[PDB]
Amino acid sequence: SHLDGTTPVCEDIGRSLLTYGRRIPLAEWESRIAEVDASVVREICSKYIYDQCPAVAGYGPIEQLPDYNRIRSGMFWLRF
Amino acid sequence: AVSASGKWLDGIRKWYYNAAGFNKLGLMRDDTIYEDEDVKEAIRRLPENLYNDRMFRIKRALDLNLKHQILPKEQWTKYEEENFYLEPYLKEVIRERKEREEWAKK
Amino acid sequence: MTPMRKTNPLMKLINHSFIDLPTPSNISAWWNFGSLLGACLILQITTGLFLAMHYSPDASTAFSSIAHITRDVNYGWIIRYLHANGASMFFICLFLHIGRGLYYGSFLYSETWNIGIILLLATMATAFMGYVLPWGQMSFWGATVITNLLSAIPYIGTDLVQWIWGGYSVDSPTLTRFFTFHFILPFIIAALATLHLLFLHETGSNNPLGITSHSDKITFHPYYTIKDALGLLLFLLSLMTLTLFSPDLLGDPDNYTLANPLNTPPHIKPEWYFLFAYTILRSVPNKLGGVLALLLSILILAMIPILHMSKQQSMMFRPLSQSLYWLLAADLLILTWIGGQPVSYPFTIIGQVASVLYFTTILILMPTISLIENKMLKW
Amino acid sequence: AAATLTSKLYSLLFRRTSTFALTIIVGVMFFERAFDQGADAIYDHINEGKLWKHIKHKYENK
Amino acid sequence: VTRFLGPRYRELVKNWVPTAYTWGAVGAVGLVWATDWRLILDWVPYINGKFK
Numbered sequence: 001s002h003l004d005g006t007t008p009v010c011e012d013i014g015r016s017l018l019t020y021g022r023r024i025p026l027a028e029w030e031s032r033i034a035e036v037d038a039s040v041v042r043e044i045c046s047k048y049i050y051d052q053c054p055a056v057a058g059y060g061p062i063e064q065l066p067d068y069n070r071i072r073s074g075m076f077w078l079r080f
Numbered sequence: 081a082v083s084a085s086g087k088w089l090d091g092i093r094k095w096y097y098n099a100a101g102f103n104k105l106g107l108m109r110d111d112t113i114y115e116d117e118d119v120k121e122a123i124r125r126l127p128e129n130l131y132n133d134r135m136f137r138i139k140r141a142l143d144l145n146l147k148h149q150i151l152p153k154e155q156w157t158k159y160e161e162e163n164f165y166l167e168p169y170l171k172e173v174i175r176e177r178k179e180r181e182e183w184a185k186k
Numbered sequence: 187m188t189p190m191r192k193t194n195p196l197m198k199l200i201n202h203s204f205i206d207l208p209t210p211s212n213i214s215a216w217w218n219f220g221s222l223l224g225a226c227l228i229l230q231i232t233t234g235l236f237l238a239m240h241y242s243p244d245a246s247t248a249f250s251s252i253a254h255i256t257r258d259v260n261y262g263w264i265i266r267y268l269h270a271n272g273a274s275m276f277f278i279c280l281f282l283h284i285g286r287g288l289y290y291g292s293f294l295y296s297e298t299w300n301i302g303i304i305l306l307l308a309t310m311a312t313a314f315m316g317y318v319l320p321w322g323q324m325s326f327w328g329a330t331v332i333t334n335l336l337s338a339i340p341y342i343g344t345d346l347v348q349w350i351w352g353g354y355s356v357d358s359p360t361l362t363r364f365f366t367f368h369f370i371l372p373f374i375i376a377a378l379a380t381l382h383l384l385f386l387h388e389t390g391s392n393n394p395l396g397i398t399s400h401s402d403k404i405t406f407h408p409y410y411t412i413k414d415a416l417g418l419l420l421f422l423l424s425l426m427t428l429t430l431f432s433p434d435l436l437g438d439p440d441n442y443t444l445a446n447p448l449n450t451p452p453h454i455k456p457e458w459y460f461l462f463a464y465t466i467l468r469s470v471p472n473k474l475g476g477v478l479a480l481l482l483s484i485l486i487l488a489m490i491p492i493l494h495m496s497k498q499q500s501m502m503f504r505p506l507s508q509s510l511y512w513l514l515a516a517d518l519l520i521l522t523w524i525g526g527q528p529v530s531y532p533f534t535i536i537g538q539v540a541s542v543l544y545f546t547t548i549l550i551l552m553p554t555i556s557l558i559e560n561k562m563l564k565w
Numbered sequence: 566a567a568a569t570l571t572s573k574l575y576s577l578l579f580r581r582t583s584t585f586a587l588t589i590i591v592g593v594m595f596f597e598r599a600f601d602q603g604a605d606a607i608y609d610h611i612n613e614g615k616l617w618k619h620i621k622h623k624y625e626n627k
Numbered sequence: 628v629t630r631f632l633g634p635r636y637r638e639l640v641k642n643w644v645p646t647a648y649t650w651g652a653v654g655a656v657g658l659v660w661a662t663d664w665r666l667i668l669d670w671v672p673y674i675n676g677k678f679k
């Protein structure tokens with residue numbers, strides 16, 4: 001749906017040629033997506049999300065925002 | 081005792097101001113007062129800019145005391161530059177309270 | 187789904203009381219002695235509980251049972267010394283708890299400050315009755331003297347001393363009666379300790395500067411749980427060193443002899459934590475007057491909030507008040523030292539001077555200096 | 566600075582808390598054995614020749 | 628109970644099985660350690676020495 005229209009198509013060509021050096025076709029995208037499985041998602045999410053130090057930004061009434069230590073302690077599970 | 085001891089009296093007053101270290105944390109004299117109902121009412125009347133500055137100074141002073149440090153001498157508060165911004169509001173509040181009590185006893 | 191700790195009834199109280207109540211970020215180690223006191227209370231119960239499984243409250247078998255616990259019962263000796271030395275650590279923390287309030291102005295929290303006074307009086311009662319349980323030479327005579335000092339009450343004294351005794355002397359009925367009171371009282375103290383926290387929680391804790399800290403509050407759990415854990419480790423270090431190396435330094439020998447009714451030891455003295463009061467009563471020439479002094483004193487602690495006339499809560503910015511505070515602390519040290527010395531001309535005059543100096547400091551000197559300090563700042 | 570050693574310890578035994586707890590239990594079991602044995606040896610050394618263990622041989626089976 | 632069945636509740640059990648085994652192992656070792664159970668402990672290469 002995003003590729004609908006001329007302008008989005010041109011943007012994809014330019015950004016891909018400066019990013020990958022090529023333009024990944026839709027067929028390739030579908031093939032890579034089909035390879036995804038629940039187990040694959042678990043491993044990748046664990047690789048990047050679990051027990052990693054986050055970066056936080058807050059602009060407003062933020063008196064209730066939990067301190068970094070509490071935020072950092074919520075990135076893992078004591079049950080796991 | 082005019083122009084012969086008032087300058088001497090100012091001297092002892094300055095000595096006590098330095099003995100009290102709240103200047104070393106950047107705190108002004110008025111910020112240090114105990115906050116009772118009268119003080120709370122007075123603070124309510126302060127303009128926004130004065131109130132915001134007072135809040136930041138208190139926050140910074142708490143932060144410094146947490147670390148067990150003090151400001152550099154260059155940033156200490158002086159005994160000839162301090163403003164008594166809170167005095168007018170406290171004075172008016174006390175006067176109003178006394179008036180109410182005086183009327184209320186008769 | 188929201189966290190269950192904000193919906194379960196039992197978890198709401200735990201979350202409010204421990205996990206998430208805002209606290210000042212800058213509170214120093216002085217604010218760590220309150221949690222230790224309760225921990226010590228907990229420690230004092232369990233140890234005593236096990237001792238109660240073997241102690242026999244009778245005039246004859248009380249001393250024998252203690253010897254049996256120390257030698258035959260497995261690990262009985264260590265339990266007894268933890269109980270004995272934990273008492274002293276409790277009072278040390280208690281005095282430091284009170285001292286912090288006087289210096290940083292915590293007494294302004296009237297409701298919380300008044301409840302504290304009751305906890306102190308109850309604690310002293312528990313400790314005094316416990317010291318009678320060993321039924322040694324010092325225990326028998328300590329109770330005898332500290333009880334005969336109610337015959338000065340105008341007209342009911344003599345009637346209200348035999349009633350406490352359960353007889354015309356101090357014998358087994360007193361021992362059993364004190365045993366029950368010793369057991370029960372600490373649990374009441376535990377309940378009162380929950381009223382202390384409750385009245386505190388509705389206003390929040392104080393900070394060393396004396397200024398309100400709403401701008402820089404912090405969740406209690408991570409920061410202060412580990413900080414209080416560190417304090418507990420240090421407290422355990424002190425307690426174990428006392429028990430495991432020199433258990434009996436802080437006790438008074440001659441308590442290891444069977445109580446002899448017809449043998450007055452040459453030098454009767456209370457326990458180290460009670461000495462300060464003993465000298466305040468031994469100095470006043472009148473027997474009734476000495477009791478009125480020991481009481482009027484403890485209660486000046488209740489009068490401190492009235493005598494306060496400074497315009498600053500914390501004595502941190504009050505250098506002259508600091509000098510008086512340390513002077514008063516030195517006076518208490520002198521009173522303690524005199525308490526342990528025999529009656530004689532030099533100690534008596536020193537004790538008399540210390541007593542008057544103690545009182546006049548609290549009453550006149552402190553208010554007057556606060557007024558002068560206020561005048562100096564041009565309030 | 567055995568950064569690789571710490572990296573291996575984390576990736577295998579600390580990433581999941583279940584393994585974290587298991588290592589703790591085995592470690593304390595081994596630690597108490599070693600700690601007790603070493604401490605008792607030190608105590609015996611400082612008090613050589615006085616403990617009954619050091620003089621019982623003169624009376625046992627004798 | 629009938630709602631607990633289905634293709635996915637089976638999957639959830641499968642994922643958590645490794646964690647369940649580890650927690651069970653932790654408890655078993657902890658119990659043995661706390662109780663100083665000679666029966667199992669006698670087959671430990673180094674700990675057995677404690678026993679005289």
Ligand SMILES: COC1=C(OC)C(=O)C(C/C=C(/C)CC/C=C(\C)CC/C=C(\C)CC/C=C(\C)CC/C=C(/C)CC/C=C(\C)CC/C=C(\C)CC/C=C(/C)CC/C=C(\C)CCC=C(C)C)=C(C)C1=O
Pocket residue numbers: 296297300301304307308310311312314315332371374378456457460461463464465467480485488489492
């Ligand atoms: C040298 O030999 C000596 C020693 O060594 C050996 C000693 O050890 C001692 C020390 C004595 C030691 C043992 C014996 C003394 C024992 C006692 C005095 C006490 C007798 C009692 C005990 C066993 C029983 C203890 C009582 C208990 C549990 C009952 C209390 C039970 C409760 C739940 C508590 C409930 C209270 C509730 C609801 C009230 C709630 C409110 C409050 C605190 C709020 C405060 C309210 C107020 C009015 C006060 C506020 C005031 C204000 C503004 C005015 C200011 C006040 C002024 C005064 C100015 C002595 C004397 C001695 O000689």
Ligand SMILES: COC1=C(OC)C(=O)C(C/C=C(\C)CC/C=C(/C)CC/C=C(\C)CC/C=C(\C)CC/C=C(/C)CC/C=C(\C)CC/C=C(/C)CC/C=C(\C)CC/C=C(\C)CCC=C(C)C)=C(C)C1=O
Pocket residue numbers: 203204207217218220221223224225227228229231232376377379380383406410414
């Ligand atoms: C600085 O910031 C902080 C704050 O400000 C933000 C705070 O506010 C606080 C919170 C304040 C504190 C702790 C301070 C104190 C305040 C408190 C609320 C808590 C008050 C304390 C108490 C009531 C005391 C609590 C308890 C204590 C010591 C325990 C006593 C009672 C018990 C149950 C304990 C257990 C004893 C046990 C089990 C006995 C041991 C024996 C066991 C195995 C053998 C037992 C055997 C049996 C019963 C056998 C029975 C057999 C039977 C019937 C036979 C059956 C036979 C059959 C055949 C069926 C903190 C810490 C803080 O840091």
Ligand SMILES: COC1=C(OC)C(=O)C(C/C=C(\C)CC/C=C(/C)CC/C=C(\C)CC/C=C(\C)CC/C=C(\C)CC/C=C(\C)CC/C=C(\C)CC/C=C(\C)CC/C=C(\C)CCC=C(C)C)=C(C)C1=O
Pocket residue numbers: 311314315332333335336350367370
């Ligand atoms: C049907 O609808 C309803 C509901 O649902 C809709 C409800 O929910 C409720 C809710 C309420 C309830 C059910 C009510 C009950 C609720 C509960 C949880 C039950 C709780 C029960 C309790 C705490 C028990 C209360 C009793 C207790 C602990 C015991 C009380 C007594 C004492 C400690 C002893 C007091 C003193 C006594 C006898 C005096 C004798 C002793 C002395 C003078 C002391 C002697 C001296 C000494 C210690 C010496 C001290 C001094 C010394 C040494 C020296 C002093 C100095 C000198 C110088 C000498 C209701 C009513 C209801 O209807």
Ligand SMILES: CCCCCCCCCCCCCCCCC[C@@H](O)O[C@H](CO[C@H](O)CCCCCCCCCCCCCCC)COP(=O)(O)OCC[N+](C)(C)C
Pocket residue numbers: 051076078415416418419579580581582585586589590654657658661
């Ligand atoms: C009974 C009387 C007890 C008295 C105790 C007195 C204690 C006095 C001294 C107080 C010391 C306070 C500090 C003690 C712990 C310090 C470390 C602690 O604060 O850290 C926390 C400790 O948390 C726990 O470690 C979490 C795991 C739970 C481990 C439980 C081990 C239980 C062992 C004993 C089991 C016994 C079983 C017996 C069965 C019969 C969080 O660690 P963290 O680094 O942030 O977790 C990250 C998790 N990762 C690694 C997976 C990413």
Ligand code: HEM
Pocket residue numbers: 216217218219220221223224280283284287292293295298299301302303305306309379382386390391392393
């Ligand atoms: C005897 C057992 C006692 C226990 C278990 C206890 C417990 C506590 C605790 C946990 C706190 C908060 C944390 C802290 O201040 O360290 C506190 C605060 C306080 N305690 Fe106690 N207390 C006891 C006795 C006393 C006594 C005898 C007094 C006498 C004055 C007292 C007066 C106060 C005051 C005024 C505060 C407020 C502190 C503040 O606002 O910063 N308490 N208590």
Ligand code: HEM
Pocket residue numbers: 227230231232233234235237238241252266269270273276312313316317318319320368369372
């Ligand atoms: C704050 C709480 C407590 C304090 C301050 C306290 C204090 C004392 C003291 C100072 C002694 C004298 C011990 C000695 O001189 O050797 C003692 C003895 C004793 N107390 Fe405690 N106690 C407390 C709680 C308890 C509890 C809860 C129990 C029982 C449930 C208990 C039971 C005993 C027993 C059995 C003795 C006799 C031990 C002996 O003779 O050495 N105590 N207590």
